[PDB]
């Protein structure tokens, strides 16, 4: 009750990024805080120049039923996955000058929901088999697989320290897992329906889940309980995406009311509507240096705010 | 102008990428996407061509999970193929109740409000030989028809077709499965095209 409210935080669309035609499902920020990657059902994965609203790279796909994409922290590779159970990894920096697919991790049977890099050689995947997995890209086979879900897994995130990861499934449950051994560190519950969006707080001591029951939640990794609930009475639709900012004050939450809401992550009560899409908000991200916010929705337009 | 000698080339690169994206979207925006449920791991995609038309059919029966978190990615399909049998009306697992529940769930779902449905009934010969000694009275005690295939078949057809709650927006094109299936689906999608086409320019 001693925290001052950030108040009304208005933002203006500096850049509208056009070129995606069909629906958009995923986006991730680059490491230099200038490049972007977006995934659509055109079978397209695009790396945008953010400062000048330019296009740096465009990549066609093989399975157009995508649900996720990733950006290598060293800027060398990208990755994607979806309803086809396998995770594809592409090399950006070749003397040939074209992006080539270097690895095809296979061995799942439920639809892939997400994928995030560990370094240039280690990745983590979660699919509809109710199982997560750590893959060693050089070898081509899993080094450890994680079982214990009864429903499909829809999200995961990798810690900044790069030692753990948290997943969430259609069982209204989430699970924190160690990486190099295989144990299930913890299992969280509380949602009234399936969980479809998770994010990892930058300090590595909390995480936030989005649900298809008109609620967002923050849990703590150590206390083993839910911290905060984020919902409003005028809202009846479901969450789709969640992300934080550099300090963490602004929790950007997508919705199905067509309006991204920026929430004051500490007071649990504020809605800085970033209205301006005509459809469902799918994906959203924040730069490493905090210089912008990008949101993408079902209307095929990607917007940059600050 | 506030550019260097090479930012011009950066801009040109972006322009080529935009042209390529637009061309690919034009190429991929004129194909008929049909979803098959029940004729022929993860999505099994099938492609074929008929009368200058590109049919992309989705055989999705290999997934072992529910449809709530999985079906909305098919919002824009032209049509749904539905395949069920008639011979298994009495086999307690029965099967008619399961098929009827599936059809009611599919037809009255929001994503397919304007989306028509093609419906197939197959394994009719086994049904015809069954009714010779196993009439529909085992599964339809209220039925009071003759011991012939035609009356019972019409009864079942009207039973499924009376489940439509969207009579003035989408129809159901029922056909007894017997190459007439391809012709049936082609005519159905032509009529879907016409009805959805004289709708976006008024004309009611």
């Amino acid at each position, epitope marked *: 009750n001693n925290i001052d409210p950030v108040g009304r935080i208005q933002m203006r669309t500096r850049r509208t990024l056009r070129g995606h035609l069909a629906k958009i499902y995923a986006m991730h920020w680059g490491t*230099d805080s*200038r*490049l972007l990657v977006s995934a659509s059902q055109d079978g397209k994965l695009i790396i945008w*120049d953010s400062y000048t609203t*330019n296009k*740096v*790279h465009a990549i066609p796909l093989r399975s157009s039923w995508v649900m996720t994409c990733a950006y290598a922290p060293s800027g060398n590779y990208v990755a994607c996955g979806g309803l086809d159970n396998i995770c594809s990894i592409y090399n950006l920096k070749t*003397r*040939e*000058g*074209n992006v080539r697919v270097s690895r095809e991790l296979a061995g799942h049977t439920g639809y892939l929901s997400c994928c995030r890099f560990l370094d240039d050689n280690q990745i983590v995947t979660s699919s509809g088999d109710t199982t997560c997995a750590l893959w060693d890209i050089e070898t081509g086979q899993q080094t450890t697989t994680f079982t214990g879900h009864t429903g499909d897994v829809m999200s995961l995130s990798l810690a900044p320290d790069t030692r753990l990861f948290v997943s969430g499934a259609c069982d209204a449950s989430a699970k924190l897992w160690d990486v190099r051994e295989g144990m299930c560190r913890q299992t969280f519950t509380g949602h009234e329906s399936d969980i479809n969006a998770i994010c990892f707080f930058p300090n590595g001591n909390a995480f936030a889940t989005g649900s298809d029951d008109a609620t967002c939640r923050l849990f703590d990794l150590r206390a083993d309980q839910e911290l905060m609930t984020y919902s409003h009475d005028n809202i009846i639709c479901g969450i789709t995406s969640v992300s934080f900012s550099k300090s963490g004050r602004l929790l950007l939450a997508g919705y199905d009311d067509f309006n991204c809401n920026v929430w004051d992550a500490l007071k649990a009560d504020r809605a800085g509507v970033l209205a301006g899409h005509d459809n469902r908000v799918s994906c959203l991200g924040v730069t490493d240096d905090g210089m912008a916010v990008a949101t993408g929705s079902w209307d095929s337009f990607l917007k940059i705010w600050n | 102008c*506030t*550019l*260097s*000698a*090479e*930012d*011009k*080339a*950066a801009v*040109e*690169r972006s322009k*080529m990428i935009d042209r390529n994206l637009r061309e690919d979207g034009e190429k991929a925006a004129r194909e008929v996407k049909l979803l098959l449920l029940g004729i022929v791991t993860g999505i099994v995609e099938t492609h074929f061509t008929f009368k200058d038309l590109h049919f992309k059919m989705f055989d999705v029966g290999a997934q072992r999970s529910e449809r709530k978190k999985w079906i909305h990615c098919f919002e824009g399909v032209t049509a749904i193929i539905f395949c069920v049998a008639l011979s298994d009306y009495d086999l307690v697992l029965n099967r008619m109740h399961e098929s009827m529940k599936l059809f009611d769930s599919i037809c009255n779902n929001k994503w397919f409000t304007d989306t028509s449905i093609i419906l197939f009934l197959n394994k009719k010969d086994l049904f015809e030989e069954k009714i010779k000694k196993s009439p529909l009275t085992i599964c339809y005690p209220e039925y009071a028809g003759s011991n012939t295939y035609e009356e019972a078949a019409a009864y079942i057809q009207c039973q499924f077709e009376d489940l439509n709650k969207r009579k003035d927006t989408k129809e159901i094109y029922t056909h007894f499965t017997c190459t007439k299936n391809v012709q049936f689906v082609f005519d159905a999608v032509t009529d879907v095209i016409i009805k959805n086409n004289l709708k976006d320019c008024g004309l009611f």
Partner: single-chain antibody
Amino acid sequence: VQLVESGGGLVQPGGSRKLSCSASGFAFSSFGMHWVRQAPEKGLEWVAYISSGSGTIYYADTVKGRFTISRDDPKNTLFLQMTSLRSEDTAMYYCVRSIYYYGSSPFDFWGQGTTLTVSSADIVMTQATSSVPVTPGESVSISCRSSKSLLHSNGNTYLYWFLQRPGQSPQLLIYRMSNLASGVPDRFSGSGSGTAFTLTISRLEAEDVGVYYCMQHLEYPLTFGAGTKLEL
């Protein structure tokens, strides 16, 4: 990658001559290409430039209206057609790749070069000296001057440092005055201030002596210096 060129030789004054370039082992049609040259006894000179998509075309003021550049993407080939050739045009030429997107490394590969012996406010750079005798085992410091400041509005700087060994073609040591091209030993450096910049080869070893050059790429035309001859 690989770049192999044809057309060199001895040509009479006047007339015309065409030099062709064949690329191998990379995506040819996503690259801009430059034709550069070097005098038989003096430094380098730039000729011409074509960009991605056969759009922008640039020529030097000396060669304007008499040299024309072109490309052919299905067969991965590049052309410089050369009219109005005079005895001052004797040189040996280089075809240089360059990919212009954010963060790329232009001038990262040069061809083997082909000999061709012929029987204003432009920024011209003055090479600071012409010979510095430095024994092996001691660092080498070379500098060059510029006619005009090179900090553009977008925070960039455009100075390039190249090295050439006897009987050889140049390679990219430094691009944009501060960056080190991958594939060369990491004991080089570059620095300096406005219009006055410097290359450094630390802990000189064998096969690390020869001619050194700098370049400006802020606005066309492109020019060069004289080339410091580091000897043993």
